[PDB]
Design a protein around this ligand. Structure first.
Ligand code: XDE
Ligand code: FE
Length: 308
């Protein structure tokens, strides 16, 4: 029968008891696997996320010198590429994040301050996430303009590498785009399309998310730039995605939804969005093809989903 989905923003609290309990930091393959301090530190952030409840301010954390150093390295190395490789919406908001959110090499921004900033721009808010959420729950949060965000940082031994999202990827990759109104509406449409959708369609929406929010390219006049969070947080792939090597195709959802992708090497192909308004329209039409015995609408005045 129709899978359960949250109907009010507070119901997202139900997700904490539905994450993958054995995280990536437990794999012998993880850069911090042999480091017990790192291990304990990850558990500390997981407990903060576990006890968090909608409406509370997100707990502030004092990062260690070693963690600030890793942030600094990532920030400084990536920043040199944005003016030439990132889509206009990213560069338009970055200076404001540097001024009101403390995006600077010597300081890791606190999620509460960043969340307040997003609320003022587009009403998006962040909530700390323990471990891995199912695609269903992750996408469902977007329907409420809620982005589940990691608060921990990657292990210091390999600053330019992370096998999972971490705070550098969330803040330098995702946050700037969520401050844009059209991108915010586009992300929310993916979320609304996921509510109560059958498992096989959630996987199609997760793939569309991968080829837009995480690895999307924008058409900007006669040029092509990156807006994908996975590209904006990867020094190597951000330079590669705008070279002659990858194959670029126009975003066509019937096609993007079933395309296979690798999570371990640079993407061999990327989809180019005409604009976020256009991508939003395409998702809305795609959503109409999803078999759901009902229709949904979000009411921002009450923060509830209306089931039609
Ligand atoms: C929890 N869903 C899949 C996960 O690998 C995932 C999802 C969304 C992201 O933005 C991301 O960087 C990683
Ligand atoms: Fe991400």
């Amino acid at each position: 029968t129709v899978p359960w989905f949250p109907r009010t923003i507070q119901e997202l609290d139900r997700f904490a008891n539905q994450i993958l309990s054995y995280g990536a930091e437990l794999d012998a393959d993880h850069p911090g696997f042999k480091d017990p301090v790192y291990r304990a530190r990850r558990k500390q952030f997981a407990d903060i996320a576990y006890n968090y409840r909608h409406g509370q301010p997100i707990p502030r954390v004092e990062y260690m010198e070693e963690e600030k150093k890793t942030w600094g390295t990532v920030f400084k190395t990536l920043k040199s590429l944005y003016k030439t490789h990132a889509c206009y919406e990213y560069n338009h908001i970055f200076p404001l994040l540097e001024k009101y959110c403390g995006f600077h090499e010597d300081n890791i921004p606190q999620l509460e301050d960043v969340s307040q900033f997003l609320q003022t721009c587009t009403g998006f808010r962040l909530r700390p996430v323990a471990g891995l959420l199912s695609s269903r729950d992750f996408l469902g949060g977007l329907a409420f303009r809620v982005f589940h965000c990691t608060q921990y940082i990657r292990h210091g031994s390999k600053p330019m590498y992370t096998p999972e999202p971490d705070i550098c990827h969330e803040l330098l990759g995702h946050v700037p785009l969520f401050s844009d109104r059209s991108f915010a509406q586009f992300s929310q449409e993916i979320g609304l399309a996921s509510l109560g959708a059958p498992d096989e369609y959630i996987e199609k929406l997760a793939t569309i998310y991968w080829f837009t929010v995480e690895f999307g390219l924008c058409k900007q006049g006669d040029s092509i730039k990156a807006y994908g969070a996975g590209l904006l947080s990867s020094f190597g792939e951000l330079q590669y995605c705008l070279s002659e090597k990858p194959k670029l195709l126009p975003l066509e959802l019937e096609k993007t939804a079933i395309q296979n992708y690798t999570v371990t090497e640079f993407q061999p192909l990327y989809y180019v969005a005409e604009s976020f308004n256009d991508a939003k329209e395409k998702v809305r039409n795609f959503a109409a093809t999803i078999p759901r015995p009902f229709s949904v609408r979000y009411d921002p005045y009450t923060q509830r989903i209306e089931v039609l």
